[PDB]
PDB file of C-alpha atoms in Angstrom:
ATOM      1  CA  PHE A   1    -121.110  27.413 -26.760  1.00  0.00           C
ATOM      2  CA  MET A   2    -120.726  23.614 -26.991  1.00  0.00           C
ATOM      3  CA  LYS A   3    -123.955  21.692 -26.285  1.00  0.00           C
ATOM      4  CA  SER A   4    -124.013  18.115 -24.934  1.00  0.00           C
ATOM      5  CA  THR A   5    -126.860  15.584 -25.262  1.00  0.00           C
ATOM      6  CA  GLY A   6    -126.611  14.866 -21.516  1.00  0.00           C
ATOM      7  CA  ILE A   7    -127.561  11.168 -21.770  1.00  0.00           C
ATOM      8  CA  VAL A   8    -126.290   8.601 -19.243  1.00  0.00           C
ATOM      9  CA  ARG A   9    -126.014   4.796 -19.503  1.00  0.00           C
ATOM     10  CA  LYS A  10    -125.141   2.120 -16.911  1.00  0.00           C
ATOM     11  CA  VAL A  11    -121.726   0.391 -17.003  1.00  0.00           C
ATOM     12  CA  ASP A  12    -121.926  -3.365 -17.666  1.00  0.00           C
ATOM     13  CA  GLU A  13    -119.555  -5.995 -16.215  1.00  0.00           C
ATOM     14  CA  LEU A  14    -116.708  -5.246 -18.665  1.00  0.00           C
ATOM     15  CA  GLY A  15    -116.934  -1.442 -18.300  1.00  0.00           C
ATOM     16  CA  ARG A  16    -118.372  -0.803 -21.781  1.00  0.00           C
ATOM     17  CA  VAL A  17    -120.708   1.980 -22.966  1.00  0.00           C
ATOM     18  CA  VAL A  18    -123.301   1.993 -25.767  1.00  0.00           C
ATOM     19  CA  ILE A  19    -123.789   4.730 -28.379  1.00  0.00           C
ATOM     20  CA  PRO A  20    -127.420   5.729 -28.943  1.00  0.00           C
ATOM     21  CA  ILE A  21    -128.723   4.520 -32.331  1.00  0.00           C
ATOM     22  CA  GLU A  22    -129.212   8.184 -33.289  1.00  0.00           C
ATOM     23  CA  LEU A  23    -125.417   8.566 -33.077  1.00  0.00           C
ATOM     24  CA  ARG A  24    -124.748   5.214 -34.785  1.00  0.00           C
ATOM     25  CA  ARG A  25    -126.474   6.567 -37.911  1.00  0.00           C
ATOM     26  CA  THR A  26    -125.119  10.144 -37.787  1.00  0.00           C
ATOM     27  CA  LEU A  27    -121.565   8.901 -37.112  1.00  0.00           C
ATOM     28  CA  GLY A  28    -121.684   6.386 -39.996  1.00  0.00           C
ATOM     29  CA  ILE A  29    -120.745   3.493 -37.683  1.00  0.00           C
ATOM     30  CA  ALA A  30    -121.798  -0.149 -38.123  1.00  0.00           C
ATOM     31  CA  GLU A  31    -120.891  -3.583 -36.711  1.00  0.00           C
ATOM     32  CA  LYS A  32    -117.331  -4.740 -37.564  1.00  0.00           C
ATOM     33  CA  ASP A  33    -116.301  -1.109 -38.206  1.00  0.00           C
ATOM     34  CA  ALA A  34    -113.250   0.274 -36.369  1.00  0.00           C
ATOM     35  CA  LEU A  35    -113.428   2.985 -33.675  1.00  0.00           C
ATOM     36  CA  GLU A  36    -110.413   4.978 -32.448  1.00  0.00           C
ATOM     37  CA  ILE A  37    -110.329   6.080 -28.798  1.00  0.00           C
ATOM     38  CA  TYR A  38    -108.768   9.275 -27.396  1.00  0.00           C
ATOM     39  CA  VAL A  39    -107.955  10.328 -23.818  1.00  0.00           C
ATOM     40  CA  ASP A  40    -107.986  13.981 -22.686  1.00  0.00           C
ATOM     41  CA  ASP A  41    -108.745  15.769 -19.388  1.00  0.00           C
ATOM     42  CA  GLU A  42    -110.001  12.527 -17.765  1.00  0.00           C
ATOM     43  CA  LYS A  43    -112.593  12.367 -20.568  1.00  0.00           C
ATOM     44  CA  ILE A  44    -112.717   9.772 -23.370  1.00  0.00           C
ATOM     45  CA  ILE A  45    -113.184  10.988 -26.966  1.00  0.00           C
ATOM     46  CA  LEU A  46    -114.245   8.370 -29.540  1.00  0.00           C
ATOM     47  CA  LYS A  47    -114.232   9.040 -33.301  1.00  0.00           C
ATOM     48  CA  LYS A  48    -114.585   7.005 -36.518  1.00  0.00           C
ATOM     49  CA  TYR A  49    -111.305   5.270 -37.414  1.00  0.00           C
ATOM     50  CA  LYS A  50    -109.939   5.804 -40.944  1.00  0.00           C
ATOM     51  CA  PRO A  51    -106.421   4.376 -41.138  1.00  0.00           C
ATOM     52  CA  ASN A  52    -104.260   5.970 -43.862  1.00  0.00           C
TER      53      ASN A  52
ATOM     54  CA  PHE B   1    -104.572  18.649 -33.280  1.00  0.00           C
ATOM     55  CA  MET B   2    -104.484  17.003 -29.829  1.00  0.00           C
ATOM     56  CA  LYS B   3    -102.525  14.094 -28.306  1.00  0.00           C
ATOM     57  CA  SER B   4    -104.417  10.844 -27.614  1.00  0.00           C
ATOM     58  CA  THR B   5    -103.735   7.181 -26.757  1.00  0.00           C
ATOM     59  CA  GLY B   6    -104.605   6.257 -30.361  1.00  0.00           C
ATOM     60  CA  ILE B   7    -106.180   2.872 -29.524  1.00  0.00           C
ATOM     61  CA  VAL B   8    -108.934   1.355 -31.692  1.00  0.00           C
ATOM     62  CA  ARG B   9    -111.525  -1.339 -30.883  1.00  0.00           C
ATOM     63  CA  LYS B  10    -114.042  -3.199 -33.084  1.00  0.00           C
ATOM     64  CA  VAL B  11    -117.770  -2.354 -32.884  1.00  0.00           C
ATOM     65  CA  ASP B  12    -119.937  -5.253 -31.661  1.00  0.00           C
ATOM     66  CA  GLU B  13    -123.517  -5.970 -32.808  1.00  0.00           C
ATOM     67  CA  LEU B  14    -125.102  -3.258 -30.621  1.00  0.00           C
ATOM     68  CA  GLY B  15    -122.564  -0.545 -31.534  1.00  0.00           C
ATOM     69  CA  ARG B  16    -120.831  -0.474 -28.130  1.00  0.00           C
ATOM     70  CA  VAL B  17    -117.198   0.347 -27.272  1.00  0.00           C
ATOM     71  CA  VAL B  18    -115.008  -0.880 -24.395  1.00  0.00           C
ATOM     72  CA  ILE B  19    -112.752   1.272 -22.198  1.00  0.00           C
ATOM     73  CA  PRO B  20    -109.274  -0.173 -21.634  1.00  0.00           C
ATOM     74  CA  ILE B  21    -108.816  -1.436 -18.052  1.00  0.00           C
ATOM     75  CA  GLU B  22    -106.078   1.184 -17.626  1.00  0.00           C
ATOM     76  CA  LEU B  23    -108.792   3.839 -18.053  1.00  0.00           C
ATOM     77  CA  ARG B  24    -111.313   1.945 -15.900  1.00  0.00           C
ATOM     78  CA  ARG B  25    -108.935   2.332 -12.941  1.00  0.00           C
ATOM     79  CA  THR B  26    -107.745   5.900 -13.649  1.00  0.00           C
ATOM     80  CA  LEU B  27    -111.322   7.095 -14.280  1.00  0.00           C
ATOM     81  CA  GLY B  28    -112.637   5.509 -11.056  1.00  0.00           C
ATOM     82  CA  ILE B  29    -115.323   3.564 -12.953  1.00  0.00           C
ATOM     83  CA  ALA B  30    -116.770   0.183 -11.935  1.00  0.00           C
ATOM     84  CA  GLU B  31    -119.718  -2.067 -12.859  1.00  0.00           C
ATOM     85  CA  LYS B  32    -123.154  -0.584 -11.999  1.00  0.00           C
ATOM     86  CA  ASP B  33    -121.629   2.927 -11.944  1.00  0.00           C
ATOM     87  CA  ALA B  34    -123.236   5.645 -14.095  1.00  0.00           C
ATOM     88  CA  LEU B  35    -121.559   7.219 -17.151  1.00  0.00           C
ATOM     89  CA  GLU B  36    -122.718  10.468 -18.786  1.00  0.00           C
ATOM     90  CA  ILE B  37    -122.312  10.845 -22.559  1.00  0.00           C
ATOM     91  CA  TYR B  38    -121.600  14.068 -24.485  1.00  0.00           C
ATOM     92  CA  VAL B  39    -121.782  14.880 -28.209  1.00  0.00           C
ATOM     93  CA  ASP B  40    -119.530  17.487 -29.868  1.00  0.00           C
ATOM     94  CA  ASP B  41    -118.021  17.905 -33.361  1.00  0.00           C
ATOM     95  CA  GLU B  42    -119.183  14.409 -34.429  1.00  0.00           C
ATOM     96  CA  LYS B  43    -117.104  13.048 -31.527  1.00  0.00           C
ATOM     97  CA  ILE B  44    -118.470  11.388 -28.369  1.00  0.00           C
ATOM     98  CA  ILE B  45    -117.123  12.533 -24.974  1.00  0.00           C
ATOM     99  CA  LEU B  46    -117.791  10.231 -21.998  1.00  0.00           C
ATOM    100  CA  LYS B  47    -117.151  11.282 -18.382  1.00  0.00           C
ATOM    101  CA  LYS B  48    -117.962   9.962 -14.889  1.00  0.00           C
ATOM    102  CA  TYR B  49    -121.538  10.831 -13.885  1.00  0.00           C
ATOM    103  CA  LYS B  50    -122.277  12.620 -10.603  1.00  0.00           C
ATOM    104  CA  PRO B  51    -125.973  12.489  -9.722  1.00  0.00           C
ATOM    105  CA  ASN B  52    -127.626  15.892  -9.159  1.00  0.00           C
TER     106      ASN B  52
END
């Protein structure tokens, strides 16, 4: 039922990954914005960060 | 509602995020390794990539 884009990127020296520009726009994320990171089932879940 | 590390990082110019070294080791990920990226519910799920 859940579909995944299935896109892979190479890991750079620091172990960082890049979001495709298509997701930068749809996720409303821009430079200097804050991301929050989750950990579940050996998978990493990243979402926009809106502190309350 | 799910439990997560709750750690946030700043977005750099290209819109990239960094995995904490604690997750680099636990996830078995190193430079030049391949990551596969998922998209669900406006959240990004990244997992180790096994070539097929």
